[PDB]
Design a protein around this ligand. Structure first.
Ligand SMILES: [Cu+2]
Ligand SMILES: [Cu+2]
Lengths: 72, 141
């Protein structure tokens, strides 16, 4: 499924993911798309900072969702 | 639970008495909503401890009653700015995006866009939600 990742200022970027992907896996996909190391990434969804070990499924993040990225 | 516990969780709110009263009135009618204090992390990565109402609201549809999970986050300027409102789907629910709910579960209603105290309140919001969601369901099984 498709999701979006926005920073405050930048262009949005699109990612292909599955519900089983961990937040870490998403960070690794962002690293492949943008070069940013996972440990410099914070991902945020609807009031929550997402935790590396949990999955998109655990947060019930559905298709076309937007995650917000802020950098250390 | 408890009016005393409630006053404590909103201790840092600029308008404590107003927030407490609106909240009591809501949970008196809507017993599966409950007040909770949690940190909300905004899209810019900043964080604030906010009181939210969390639970379900009953929405009749097609002969059945769907208990839709929501979260209503109150900013510390409540009631002068509207709640941030979300549908919170469970593993058995899919968001049906549309005019009033986006892919993230964020809720959109005229009541929120035109929010103005004292005419707008939590109870008013919830009943509008129930009317709108009864015609335009935001989830499916
Ligand atoms: Cu890589
Ligand atoms: Cu409508």
């Amino acid at each position: 499924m498709q999701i979006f990742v926005k920073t405050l200022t930048g262009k949005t970027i699109t990612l292909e993911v599955e519900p089983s992907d961990t937040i870490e896996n998403v960070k690794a996909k962002i690293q492949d798309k943008e070069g940013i190391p996972p440990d410099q990434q914070r991902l945020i969804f609807a009031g929550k900072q997402l935790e590396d070990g949990r999955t998109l499924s655990d947060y019930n993040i559905q298709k076309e969702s937007t995650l917000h990225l802020v950098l250390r | 639970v408890s009016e005393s516990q409630l006053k404590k969780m909103v201790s840092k709110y600029k308008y404590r008495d107003l927030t407490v009263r609106e909240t009591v009135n809501v949970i008196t009618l809507y017993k599966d909503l409950k007040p909770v204090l949690d940190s909300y992390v905004f899209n810019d990565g900043s964080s604030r401890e906010l009181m939210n109402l969390t639970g379900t609201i009953p929405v009749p549809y097609r002969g059945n009653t769907y208990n839709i999970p929501i979260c209503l986050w109150l900013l510390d300027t409540y009631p002068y700015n509207p709640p941030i409102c979300f549908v919170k789907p469970t593993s058995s629910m899919t968001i049906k995006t549309g005019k009033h709910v986006d892919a993230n579960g964020k809720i959109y209603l005229p009541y929120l866009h035109e929010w103005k105290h004292p005419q707008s309140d939590l109870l008013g919001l919830i009943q509008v939600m129930i009317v709108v969601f009864g015609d335009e369901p935001p989830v499916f099984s």
